[PDB]
Design a protein around this ligand. Structure first.
Ligand SMILES: Nc1ncnc2c1ncn2[C@@H]1O[C@H](COP(=O)(O)O)[C@@H](O)[C@H]1O
Ligand SMILES: Nc1ncnc2c1ncn2[C@@H]1O[C@H](COP(=O)(O)O)[C@@H](O)[C@H]1O
Ligand SMILES: [Ca+2]
Lengths: 299, 299
C-alpha cells in the first residue's frame, strides 16, 4: 500500500533529473537519513477514457513487481508515497546516465567489453525471468549506469511501467512498446511472455555492435512490416568487424517463433557471452566494435 | 512542393488552437487578404529513429490527401510553408470547437437531431471513401464545428495525419489510432481499408446516444481485448430510450468481419439515417439521447 503522506515532509526535493510520458523524476534526499534517491512522480489517470497519466491499478502492478526485485543490475525501490494527483516512487538514485550516451563518448570498444555490458543486462533479465517477470520495455533509454566515471560502469535496468508477471495458462496480450524494439508477437497481438524480452536484447545488441538498427524503416509502417517479416541483414558496411559468434548470438534472438528464440538461460550460455575455451576468448578480444556509425546515430 | 519561405512573413500568427504529437496549431491571418486560417506546425523528424517529429514522406502524404478534398464537411487546405524545423499547413479555420462539447451544453437532444449531425459526418466520410481515402482517425476530437453559435452547427472533420489512400491489391497494415475507437483489424494487425472508418463511426454513434463507450475497459489491455472479442452490450441503464433503429445501425457497424460491416453508402441509406417512411421518422423523433450520461462522461 502507498503511504498517504506528503513526500516533501520526508524528503528534500531537488532538481529534475529526467522525464517521460506520465512521469517526472527529481533528485531527493530523505531528511531522516540524508541518503539520496530519485523520486519518480507518476501522474495518475483520472478517467478510463483519458489518454493522460497512468491508471492507478497499473501503477500498483509496477510497484508490486518492484517490491519483489533486489538484484545488482535492477533498480531498487525504496518507498512509495501518494497524494491527490501523483504516486511517487522513491527509487535508488542512478547517476551515470544512459549506457548508450556513455558508449557514444567512448574512444574504443572491443567485443569483450561489449559482452561485459550485455552480460550485465542478461544477469538482470535472468533474475527477472526466474521470477516470471517480463520487463517488456527493454531499450537503450531504460538501461542506465550507476556511475559512468569508473573503468567498468555498472548497469541498472529501470522503468517497470510495462513489466508484467507471466502466469502459466493465463494469456497476456496487449499493445505497447517502442516499435524499433518490440517482438513480432507484440506487433501481431499474439500471446506474450518472457520471450519478447529476448528479442529486444537481440535488437539492443545489434545496435550496440554496429550503430545500425535491424528493423528500423523510413516509417513506423515499414518498421512493423520488417519486424513481422523478420527482415534484417548484417550489412558489411557496418558489420565488417563483427565476429561470427556475435552474429550467431543475434541470429538466435531475432527469431519469430517464440519456442525457438533463445531463452535467457541459453543466452547466458551462448559462447559469445560465455566462451568455453581460450580460442573463443581471443576471437572476442580481437573483435573491435563500430563506434563510428554508433556515434553518428547516438550523438 | 512546399513554399520555402517564412510563414511569418505572410501571416500574423495568433493564439494556440490545439496541439498533438509533433504538431501545434495556431490561428493566423494572411496579411495580404486579412483572411483567417489555422496554421498547423508539424515538427519534422530529424533521424529515422526518433520518437520525435514526423518524417518527410508522412507529412507529404497528409498534404497530398488534403489537396484532393473539397467538401463542406472536411477542412480545406489553403497553403503549405516550410522552414528548417517545421512544415506549416495553412488550413481552413474551424472556430466552433468539438461537436461533443457543443452537445454537452445542450438541454435536450432527440435522435432526429442526433442523426442530422451524424449524417454530416457520414457525408464527409462518404466523400473521402469515394476517393478511396480512409481517414483512420475518426474520433470525437477530430469532429469539429465551424461555428458553435448558430442553432444547428456545421461539422468539419479535421486531422488527416493518419489518412491513407487505399490502393486495390496493395496491402496496408499499420499500428495507430486511439484504442477506444480502433477496429479489430487495427488491433490484430490485419489488412486495413475503408471499413475501419465505419467501425469508428459505430463507436462514435454509440457514445453520442448513450454517453457510454462500447469497448472501453478499465485498462488499455481490456479495451483491446473487448474490441477483438467485439464484446459490448446495450446496457438498459443507458439505452432504455434509444430506438431499435439506432441500435440496428450500431450493430451493423460494430462487426469484426470487414466484408460484413456496413459501407459508408449503406450507412447513409440505413433507415435510422434516412427513413423510408413516415413511421420510422416518428420513432426517431420520439427517441432521446441520454444527455445525462453523455454530460457525465464528457466532463
Ligand atoms: N532511478 C533513477 N535515478 C536517476 N535518474 C532517473 C531514475 N529513473 C529515471 N531517471 C531519469 O528519468 C528519465 C525517465 O525515466 P523513466 O520514465 O523511468 O524511463 C531517465 O531517462 C533518467 O534521466
Ligand atoms: N483547422 C483547424 N481549426 C481549428 N483547430 C484545429 C484545426 N486543426 C486542428 N485543430 C486543433 O488542433 C489539434 C491538433 O491538430 P492535429 O495535429 O491535426 O490533430 C486538434 O485536435 C484541434 O483541437
Ligand atoms: Ca494478428
Amino acid at each position: 500500500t502507498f503511504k498517504q503522506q506528503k513526500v516533501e515532509d520526508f524528503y528534500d526535493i531537488g532538481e529534475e533529473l529526467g522525464s517521460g510520458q506520465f512521469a517526472i523524476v527529481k533528485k531527493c534526499r530523505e531528511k531522516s537519513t540524508g541518503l539520496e534517491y530519485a523520486a519518480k512522480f507518476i501522474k495518475k489517470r483520472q478517467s478510463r477514457a483519458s489518454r493522460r497519466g497512468v491508471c492507478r491499478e497499473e501503477i500498483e502492478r509496477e510497484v508490486s513487481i518492484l517490491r519483489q526485485v533486489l538484484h545488482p543490475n535492477i533498480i531498487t525501490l525504496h518507498d512509495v508515497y501518494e497524494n491527490r494527483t501523483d504516486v511517487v516512487l522513491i527509487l535508488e538514485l542512478v547517476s551515470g546516465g544512459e549506457l548508450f550516451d556513455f558508449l557514444a563518448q567512448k574512444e574504443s570498444l572491443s567485443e569483450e567489453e561489449a559482452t561485459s555490458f550485455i552480460k550485465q543486462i542478461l544477469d538482470g533479465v535472468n533474475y527477472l525471468h526466474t521470477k516470471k517477470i517480463a520487463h517488456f520495455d527493454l531499450k537503450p533509454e531504460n538501461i542506465m549506469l550507476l556511475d559512468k566515471n569508473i573503468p567498468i560502469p555498472h548497469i541498472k535496468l529501470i522503468d517497470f511501467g510495462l513489466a508484467h508477471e507471466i502466469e502459466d495458462g493465463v494469456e497476456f496480450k496487449n499493445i505497447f512498446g517502442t516499435p524499433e524494439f518490440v517482438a513480432p508477437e507484440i506487433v501481431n497481438y499474439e500471446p506474450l511472455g518472457l520471450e519478447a524480452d529476448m528479442w529486444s536484447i537481440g535488437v539492443i545488441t545489434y545496435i550496440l555492435l554496429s550503430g545500425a538498427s535491424p528493423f528500423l524503416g523510413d516509417t513506423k509502417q515499414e518498421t512493423l512490416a520488417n519486424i513481422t517479416a523478420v527482415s534484417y541483414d548484417f550489412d558489411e558496411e557496418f558489420f565488417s568487424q563483427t565476429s561470427e559468434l556475435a552474429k550467431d548470438f543475434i541470429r538466435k534472438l531475432l527469431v519469430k517463433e517464440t519456442r525457438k528464440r533463445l531463452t535467457i538461460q541459453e543466452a547466458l550460455r551462448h559462447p559469445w557471452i560465455t566462451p568455453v575455451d581460450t580460442q573463443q576468448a581471443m576471437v572476442r578480444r580481437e573483435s573491435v566494435v563500430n563506434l563510428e556509425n554508433f556515434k553518428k546515430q547516438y550523438v
